[PDB]
Scaffold this motif. Sequence first.
Motif, short mmCIF file in Angstrom:
data_model
loop_
_atom_site.label_atom_id
_atom_site.label_comp_id
_atom_site.label_asym_id
_atom_site.label_seq_id
_atom_site.Cartn_x
_atom_site.Cartn_y
_atom_site.Cartn_z
N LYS C 297 4.63 2.23 10.18
CA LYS C 297 4.18 0.87 9.86
C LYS C 297 2.70 0.83 9.51
N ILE C 298 1.87 1.55 10.28
CA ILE C 298 0.44 1.62 9.99
C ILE C 298 0.18 2.28 8.64
N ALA C 299 0.94 3.33 8.31
CA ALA C 299 0.79 3.99 7.03
C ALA C 299 1.18 3.09 5.87
N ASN C 300 2.21 2.26 6.06
CA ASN C 300 2.57 1.28 5.03
C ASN C 300 1.50 0.22 4.86
N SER C 301 0.79 -0.12 5.92
CA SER C 301 -0.22 -1.16 5.81
C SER C 301 -1.56 -0.68 5.25
N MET C 302 -1.89 0.61 5.34
CA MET C 302 -3.13 1.12 4.76
C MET C 302 -2.88 2.00 3.53
N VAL C 303 -1.95 1.58 2.67
CA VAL C 303 -1.88 2.16 1.34
C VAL C 303 -3.11 1.74 0.54
N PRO C 309 -1.45 13.80 2.44
CA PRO C 309 0.00 13.68 2.25
C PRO C 309 0.55 12.45 2.95
N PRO C 310 1.83 12.13 2.76
CA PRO C 310 2.45 11.08 3.57
C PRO C 310 2.45 11.41 5.06
N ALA C 311 2.58 10.35 5.86
CA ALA C 311 2.48 10.47 7.31
C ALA C 311 3.63 11.29 7.86
N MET C 312 3.33 12.08 8.89
CA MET C 312 4.22 12.94 9.68
C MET C 312 4.82 14.10 8.90
N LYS C 313 4.47 14.28 7.62
CA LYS C 313 5.15 15.36 6.85
C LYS C 313 4.50 16.65 7.24
N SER C 314 3.18 16.74 7.13
CA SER C 314 2.47 17.94 7.57
C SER C 314 2.72 18.23 9.04
N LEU C 315 2.88 17.18 9.84
CA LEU C 315 3.18 17.36 11.25
C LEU C 315 4.60 17.89 11.46
N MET C 350 9.91 8.48 8.86
CA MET C 350 9.20 8.92 7.66
C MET C 350 9.76 8.30 6.39
N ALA C 351 11.03 7.90 6.41
CA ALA C 351 11.65 7.27 5.26
C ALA C 351 11.25 5.82 5.07
N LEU C 352 10.58 5.22 6.05
CA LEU C 352 10.08 3.86 5.91
C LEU C 352 8.72 3.81 5.23
N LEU C 353 8.22 4.95 4.77
CA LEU C 353 7.02 5.00 3.96
C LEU C 353 7.27 4.35 2.61
N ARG C 354 6.28 3.61 2.12
CA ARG C 354 6.38 2.95 0.83
C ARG C 354 5.10 3.18 0.05
N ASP C 355 5.24 3.26 -1.27
CA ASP C 355 4.06 3.47 -2.14
C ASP C 355 3.45 2.11 -2.51
N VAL C 356 2.48 2.12 -3.43
CA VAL C 356 1.82 0.88 -3.90
C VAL C 356 2.82 0.05 -4.69
N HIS C 357 3.88 0.68 -5.19
CA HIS C 357 4.90 -0.02 -6.01
C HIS C 357 6.06 -0.49 -5.13
N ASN C 358 5.97 -0.32 -3.81
CA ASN C 358 6.98 -0.80 -2.85
C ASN C 358 8.22 0.06 -2.92
N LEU C 359 8.14 1.22 -3.54
CA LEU C 359 9.27 2.17 -3.57
C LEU C 359 8.95 3.35 -2.69
N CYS C 360 9.93 3.87 -1.99
CA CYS C 360 9.76 5.05 -1.16
C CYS C 360 9.30 6.21 -2.04
N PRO C 361 8.32 6.99 -1.59
CA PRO C 361 7.78 8.05 -2.44
C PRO C 361 8.78 9.18 -2.66
N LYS C 362 8.64 9.87 -3.78
CA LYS C 362 9.62 10.92 -4.08
C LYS C 362 9.19 12.21 -3.39
N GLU C 363 8.17 12.14 -2.56
CA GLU C 363 7.75 13.33 -1.80
C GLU C 363 8.45 13.33 -0.46
#
Lengths: 260, 72, 393
Positions: C297-303, C309-315, C350-363
């Motif tokens: 949720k925090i990652a979606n709010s600070m786009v 990278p996206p949140a939790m992926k490197s982790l 991690m699938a609740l991540l969204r880009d600036v276009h409101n679509l889930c990233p393809k990464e």
Amino acid sequence: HELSVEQQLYYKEITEACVGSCEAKRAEALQSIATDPGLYQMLPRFSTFISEGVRVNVVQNNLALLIYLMRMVKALMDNPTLYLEKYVHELIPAVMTCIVSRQLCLRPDVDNHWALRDFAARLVAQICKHFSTTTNNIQSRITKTFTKSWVDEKTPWTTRYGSIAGLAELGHDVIKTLILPRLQQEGERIRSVLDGPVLSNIDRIGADHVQSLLLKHCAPVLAKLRPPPDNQDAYRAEFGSLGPLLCSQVVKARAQAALQ
Amino acid sequence: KTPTYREPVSDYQVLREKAASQRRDVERALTRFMAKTGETQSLFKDDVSTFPLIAARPFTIPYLTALLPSEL
Amino acid sequence: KIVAYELKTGGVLLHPIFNPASHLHFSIKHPHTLSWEYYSMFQCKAHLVMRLIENRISMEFMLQVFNKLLSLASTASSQKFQSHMWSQMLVSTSGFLKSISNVSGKDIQPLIKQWVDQSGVVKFYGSFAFNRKRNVLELEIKQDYTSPGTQKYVGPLKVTVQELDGSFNHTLQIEENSLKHDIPCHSKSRRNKKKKIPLMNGEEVDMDLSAMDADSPLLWIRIDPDMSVLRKVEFEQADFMWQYQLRYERDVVAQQESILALEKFPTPASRLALTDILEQEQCFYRVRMSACFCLAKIANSMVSTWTGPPAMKSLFTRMFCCKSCPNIVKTNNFMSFQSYFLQKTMPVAMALLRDVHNLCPKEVLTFILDLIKYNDNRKNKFSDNYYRAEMID
């Protein structure tokens, strides 16, 4: 080394679909074998299944299951992804057994073992077109088995039919240098056709099947290496019939040229 | 006259890729074969070539096929 | 669950007197007219009120009450008299309170009158201010008692303040006209020297005091930490106090409520706090499973501020994938039961991540599909059905 349950189930369903419960599941199983990308790791199981199943014809002379196994081999050859080079030493004698064995039938007189003959002959011509290399010597070793089965007497008319069928599906130069020297053997055949003390035996249908295959395949060979007239070539030929077939073949070639 | 051998592929990355892609391809081939030779459903109208679903059949006793382990 | 249900519709009334509850569309005189959600919340509130009675009268006296009831019933259960004595196997409220008063000498009649006979929960709104001159902490606790599900609390209230000198408990008397409660604060001499700050338990830790205010010693405040009332707390701390309470607290309910309150502060210090919670074994696993969704949720709010990278992926690749191949997941070994739960809950958040276009990233979608493809379960002694089901989720 042991197949995972996924591919164990796939092997079970695909092999039991080609045993003869219905035709539509068989056609979808053969269209699966011919057109799937990942069927390696299950190729040795299919080769063992096919070779053992063609061996099990000696206990039960089932023509139908042999036709199904030959359509399984023909479907395995059409797969672009899997390479049958490492397993061709198992599939060659199975198709050879379907060609040059003598009892392919349960009731010899009515079963058309003849088609499993020309189908498997076309199959072995394809298997030695795609895989014969000078290190392999597949085609020379297949022609030598067919040749010493044909030239040698005491061979039954079924196995001579298989030998002539394979040799004539190999190509034009093979029937030039193998079939055409023994055309006098047609006289030895017509010894037992136009004049047989026993008419009601089973040698006559096999003999005139051998005759029909011989003159069908030797008609374009006679059309290639003779004059265009062919006035009494049949009289010069053995029994005067091969020559009539050659005249028919020249007529067919003229018709094909007209169509072109 | 010293013999040579074939190039061995001992790489964990390409072995994981080979085993993964072969498992995915054999399970896709199995499910398409079983959906084509039986009753089928479809998420889209008249959709058998792309995404065929094996049709849901009811069991007479469903706990036996649910709860029981198959590999043991 | 109960504060959500009681604020939603009326309230659950344990021990009614025969209507006693007319705020709800069924009659509570018989069990077969109750709604099923009311029956479930009835059992839930009953066991929480029994925990409250254990809080007032200690657990060994509570087990002595239960043993006295069972012993009366088992002396009753062997007689043959037709109910001269077989009714000692039936408990009532008055008999239960009398047995409590027999074993302890205290009666719980105010607690029974508040939480059983009255059918409501309490709502607390707290805000603090630190008086630097007199070194006091002025709390401001007001109740919402005009909502349909609520009631007014007038008892005592425990509050736990973590300052630099340690963790101190204070009891506040919250009468009807009360609003400001001045509690005293201790020194700040553990910022003069670097010493370890002692925690709620006996241990002490090194804290990074760069985010703390210079004038206040207090690190976090918790109103009613032991859940000694049926309450819903809305405390207004500062975001660094919520991050300190997430990191260094030795209570899982305070870590959960700090995760729940960090969703309103999307600053990168809160991202660092939740990421340090996620990396940390010896944290309770259900706190890390909540920190996954809070970090999403925090990652979606600070786009348009997120750096790498996206949140939790490197982790995820650091914790659960191979060292030589980052995008190939390790073969499944589910024998730890805490990294199994965290591994099966991290792509779902991690699938609740969204880009600036409101679509889930393809990464992240490609990462989830590679988690599905490279899944190998031929080696663990446990099944894979829940992990694969969470992959579909």
